[PDB]
RNA sequence: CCCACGGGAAU
RNA sequence: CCCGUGGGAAU
């Protein structure tokens, strides 16, 4: 029940390169469903509009007009709406959609965007935050979403979705950027489970890495209040990174995307695991070629990778990176800054300062040998 | 005018002069007919197209022949000069059919500019070019002036001027040298004497002529690679070619990778009228550096004082494995017999040959042992 | 045209 | 869609 879009149209418009000129149109594919996700789609429509402001002709506004009509022809139940948009919404449309969502708790909306539109201009940032604040889930389109869009909205003729190169690289950059803009906070239980520095008797291997950037201004380190969030490692996926991507590598990918100048910058990261050998070798390689950027790496635990991890940590120290185990100081900072604590002060786990001292000694042992 | 012009997208993709270029299964042939008078107007102009495959019923050369036979009988009998721009060089069958045509018609002379050489490594298409040149056809590679002239007379340009693609002169260099090899171009005897006389250069003219040959190692024999030997000169600076010029030693280095030599030991010999400058010798050193299966013999008629670091370059070149020697009567007779259009005449040495040869040989040692 | 890479701070 | 490269040994 969709007049599908040309496959040539989809490939050029849903290309998720974060910086991409020449696309003057916003494409919005949408579905309507019931409370039950398993059920079939009630309706589906495609909307297009030009980017520059005669803003009531953006596809977000056209959906609102169509949806009001469509609602008055259907019975009142709970509806789940999904958008695939080539560009994130403008400041005006975000308000108008936020307006809509408040007057209608029967409707919940999830927005998958391919690219972030003007993610560096603070107008469009508030547009996204206002939209999430009004209840809308806001995610970046990934392979599964691009393929699902190709299936339902594109005149593919049975031809399969074929991803472009650098699709996961772009998803990485855009997801972290959205996390920064929306100020995604870590779940408080998640932080405690992964940053407790007692010996790891558990089976879950995942790495969470918090990051912040400061600039040297006069003799003070001034926070770049725009570049701080957290990220975790990418599970292996044939439709993404086939061998996974460790959190240290995704963090290295972000730094060039920030477009930092030649000034003095200090990038601080708090990782639940010390890097393995290959990740530490890439980080050392980085500060090697960027001596205007210093790098402070605090780790909650030392990752024994059953390999050359001790050599990687030494390589990291010899090349200018600060390497230290997190003490109570850092654990409280991460709690207060990156966790969805909601007032609660930092509640230390048992043996924090003791495990912290023990790891600090073991880390020195690695570096002085 | 009286041409149904071709789409500019067609011209840009089809007349691209990259020597190795797949995906172009069509031969485009733009041709003009003119009179004895060069100033005179074009009588008629036509575009012909045909498929590349040897089985295609009418290659564009054959379609021209049929069209010209009709067109001739509608015009009075005079002398005609025909010009072709062809995206691909001709096959052997069309070459014979055109060669047959020109012999039975001395009133017609034909010049063929090709954009790319088709199968220049297979002796069929090589023989095709020699068949055609021998029957009187001028055979040249298209350069900037021709690509532009083709764009003006045959292309639906919409007033927009011809805009050359990148590496047009890089490609032209390779294709021009290849054609000279295939057609067995020989040097003009006056040019050879003027540039290789080893007396002190009292003239103002600085240009470099460089002869080249390849030898192959078989057991302990240097067996001539009788397929890659010719001559070339340095490219003067031109905004529509190499804007900063191209020294002849560099054009010689460009050829060697294009030859696609095997892993065997190969010795590429060159006889240059001038010793390399410092930067050219430094590039030659870089080459023998990165190719230790290829050795390099450089014989020079005269030592080039470049008002710079040339003596260091000559020292670096001899150290890194390249042989450097001055041409003696030995070498001068070889180059005359091999690369010059002598037509029987034996080598007549200029005055003071061996003396200038010995005098420069001493000056070269002085460079090498200091 | 086929393949790979880089770039687009984006009416 | 635009720009800059590299590769086409050539149905
Ligand atoms: Zn808008
Ligand atoms: Zn790692
Ligand atoms: Zn033919
Ligand atoms: Zn030179």
Numbering used by the authors:
A (entry chain A): 8 to 142, 147 to 380
B (entry chain B): 7 to 142, 147 to 380
What does the publication say?
The ability to bind nucleic acids and form oligomerization is attributed mainly to CD1/NTD (referred to as CD1 hereafter), while deaminase activity is performed by CD2/CTD (referred to as CD2 hereafter). In this study, we describe four structures of a soluble primate rA3G variant from rhesus macaque, rA3GR8/E259A, in complex with AA and GA dinucleotide-containing RNA molecules in the form of ssRNA and dsRNA with 5′- or 3′-overhangs.
RNA2-AA was modified with 3′ overhang on both strands (5′ dsRNA8-A9A10U11U12U13U14, designated as RNA2-AAxtal, with dsRNA8 5′-CCCGUGGG-3′/5′-CCCACGGG-3′). Complexes with RNA1-AAxtal and RNA2-AAxtal were determined as two different types of dimers with two rA3G molecules binding to one RNA molecule at 2.90 and 3.10 Å, respectively. In both cases, the electron density maps of RNA were of sufficient quality to allow de novo building of a complete dsRNA8 plus three nucleotides (3-nt) on each AA dinucleotide-containing overhang (5′-U2A3A4-dsRNA8-3′ and 5′-dsRNA8-A9A10U11-3′). In both dimer models, there are no direct contacts between the two rA3GR8/E259A monomers, which is reminiscent of A3H-dsRNA complexes showing RNA-assisted dimer formation. When in complex with 5′- or 3′-overhang dsRNA containing unpaired AA dinucleotide, RNA-mediated rA3G dimers are formed. These RNA-mediated dimers can have different dimerization arrangements, depending on whether the ssRNA is 5′- or 3′-overhang and the length of the dsRNA region.
